[PDB]
C-alpha cells in the first residue's frame with residue numbers, strides 16, 4: 221500500500237539523542253521547534269532517522285542522517301545542515317562512526333574538566349561520588365565544552381536561547397561523576413548588579429550582585445536520582461558563602477524546578493530552626509524578617525511563599 | 537504593524553487606566569527645551585494648583601524666537617480633570633533656544649544657549665540681562681550648579697566647554713575657564729555632580745565620557761570609552777557615586793564614580809537613540825529616559841536583576857516601570873517636577889507638549 | 903537579552919488568559935510597562 225504520509229515525521233521522534241559511555245543510551249528531545257520549525261514536523265523523507273550522539277565524557281558530537289528515500293527538491297529541508305548549524309563548527313563528526321570513536325578515545329586521554337576548572341563541592345549518591353565544578357565562558361576549554369552541550373538547552377528547556385559566550389558575567393557549573401569523569405549535567409548562571417539604595421551603595425566599594433540560575437540541566441539518563449537537588453544545593457551553598465551575592469534568583473522556572481527549589485529551600489529553613497520562628501505568635505519585627513531574608517539570600521517572592529507555607533504546615 | 541497614528545489612538549484609549557492625568561497642547565512652534573520652575577504649589581480660586589514651566593521656540597528663522605514662561609494650572613487631585621495653561625511672559629530671543637535652565641539659588645534668573653552657541657542670561661522680571669559669547673557653533677549642553685550659586689557650564693558643537701560664574705557681582709559675560717582639550721567632537725551634554733561642587737561630567741560625539749574637576753590643572757579625573765556616543769548623562773540625587781549615561785546604542789548605562797572601568801549595568805527598552813536622562817529627586821533609584829523612538833521610559837534601579845514570571849519578562853526587563861507612548865515624534869526634552877513627585881512635562885519634535893502623571897496605583901509610587 | 907538563557911520564543915502562544923482580571927491593580931502595572939500600546 222502507498223503511504224505518502226510516512227514521508228512526514230515528528231521531529232521529536234526522528235531525532236535520536238544518544239549519550240555513549242559503556243553503552244549507548246538513547247532518548248527523545250522534548251523540543252525541536254527551534255531547529256525544525258514550530259510544527260516540529262519534517263517533510264520529504266521516508267523512514268527518517270536523525271542520530272545525534274555524544275561521548276559520555278567529552279561530549280564530542282556525532283551526526284548521522286538516514287532515510288529509505290527522499291524527495292530530491294530545493295523546497296525540501298536539508299535536515300543534516302539544519303542540525304549542524306546548531307552545533308559547533310567543525311567539531312562534529314558526520315556519518316563515520318568509527319572515525320567518531322577514534323576521536324573521543326584520543327580526547328579522553330587529554331585533560332578533564334576536573335583538571336582545569338575550579339572545584340566547588342562533592343556529594344555521594346546511590347553509593348557513588350560526584351563533583352561540582354565551575355568556570356567562566358571565556359576559557360577556551362570551557363567554551364569548547366559548552367558549545368558541545370548547548371543544544372541540550374534547546375532540546376529540553378522550552379524557549380531556551382544560546383547565551384552570549386563573550387559576556388564575562390556568565391558562570392557555568394559542571395556536574396561530574398568523580399571516578400568516570402562523565403558529565404552528569406550543567407547549569408548556566410549569571411550575576412546582575414544589585415542596587416541596595418544610596419546608603420548601602422555609598423558605604424561599600426565592593427560590588428553587590430543578584431545571582432541567577434538560568435539553564436539548569438541534568439541529562440535525561442541521570443534524572444530522578446536526586447542529582448537535581450544535590451546540584452541545586454551545592455550551587456546555593458557556594459552562593460551563601462559568596463560575599464558579593466545578596467540574593468539567589470531563577471530565570472523563568474518551570475513547575476519541576478519550582479518543586480525542587482521549594483523542597484530544598486524548606487528543608488534548609490527547618491535545618492536552620494525556622495519552624496520555631498515562623499509561628500502565628502512569634503515576635504516577628506519588620507527588621508528581623510528583613511534580616512532573616514537577607515541572611516537566607518532568598519528572593520522576596522520565594523521568601524514570602526516559604527514563610528506562608530511554614531505557618532500553614534506546622535499549624536494544620 | 538500599527539502606524540504612528542494608530543498606535544497613538546491605542547495609547548489614547550488606555551490613558552484613563554495608566555495615568556492620574558494627561559494634558560496635551562499643540563504649540564505654534566516646537567520647543568527644544570522644557571523645565572519646571574521650583575515655584576511652590578499653590579491652590580488658586582477654582583481649586584486649580586499653580587505650577588510654572590519654561591519653554592522656548594524654534595521658528596527656523598521664520599519669525600522672532602521667544603523664551604516663554606507658562607503657568608500650568610493643574611487639577612487639585614494631581615497632588616493626591618483638566619488644566620488651564622497661560623503664557624505669562626515672552627522675551628525675544630536671538631535664534632532658537634536649544635536649552636533654558638533656571639538658576640537654583642535664584643530662579644528669577646534663567647540661562648539659555650542658542651543655535652550659534654551664544655549663552656544668554658534672562659531675568660523673569662526684567663528680560664534679557666547679559667550675552668555670554670565664547671562658543672562659535674550651536675550648543676546643546678547647559679547646566680547650573682545646585683551647589684555654587686551662579687556656576688554655569690556650557691558646551692558646543694564646536695568641541696568646546698566653558699565655565700561661567702554669573703551669580704556673584706561684577707561682570708559675568710566672560711568665562712572664568714574654557715576647555716579646548718576635553719573632547720575632539722561635538723559636546724552632547726555636560727552636568728554638575730549633586731554633592732561635589734567641583735565635579736562635572738561631559739559626553740561627546742567622540743565616544744568619550746569624562747569626569748572633570750574645575751580646580752585641577754589637568755581637569756579630567758576619569759575617561760570612559762563609550763560603546764557608541766552618549767548623548768546625555770545624569771547624576772544621582774541620592775548617591776554621591778552613581779550616574780547614568782545613554783545615547784546612540786539605545787541602552788541606559790549606570791556607572792560607579794569609584795570604578796569607571798566598566799558599567800554597573802545597562803537597561804534595555806528604547807528602540808533608538810536615548811537623548812535625555814534624569815534621576816528622580818523624590819525616589820532613590822528612579823531614572824527617566826527619553827529618545828528618538830518617541831518614548832519616555834521610567835526605570836527603577838532597585839529592580840535590576842529582580843526575579844520575574846515568564847509572562848512578566850515578555851513585557852521587558854524588571855527595572856522598566858512604565859513607558860510613556862503619548863508622543864508621535866522624537867522627544868526634544870522633558871523635566872520631572874521637583875515639587876510634585878511623578879509629574880512630568882515632555883515636548884516632542886512636532887509641536888506637542890504633554891503634561892502627565894502616571895497612575896498612583898503603580899507600586900513604585902506606593 | 904543581557905544574561906538571558908530563556909529569552910527565546912515559546913512553541914505556541916496560549917489562548918486562555920489567567921489574567922481576565924484586567925482593569926485591576928497588577929493589570930495597571932502590565933499596561934504601564936506595555937505603554938498601553940500592546
Ligand SMILES: CC(C)(COP(=O)(O)OP(=O)(O)OC[C@H]1O[C@@H](n2cnc3c(N)ncnc32)[C@H](O)[C@@H]1OP(=O)(O)O)[C@@H](O)C(=O)NCCC(=O)NCCS
Pocket residue numbers: 376377434435436437438439443444445446447448449450473474476477479480483
Ligand atoms: C529535575 C531534574 C534535575 C531531575 O533531578 P531530581 O533531583 O532527581 O528531581 P526529582 O524528579 O527526582 O524529584 C525529587 C523527588 O523527591 C520526592 N519528594 C519528596 N518529598 C516531596 C515533596 N514534599 N514534594 C514533591 N516531591 C517530593 C519526589 O519523588 C520527587 O519527585 P517528583 O517531585 O518529581 O515527583 C531533571 O528533571 C532535569 O534537568 N530536567 C530538564 C531540565 C529543566 O527543565 N530545568 C528547569 C528549567 S531551567
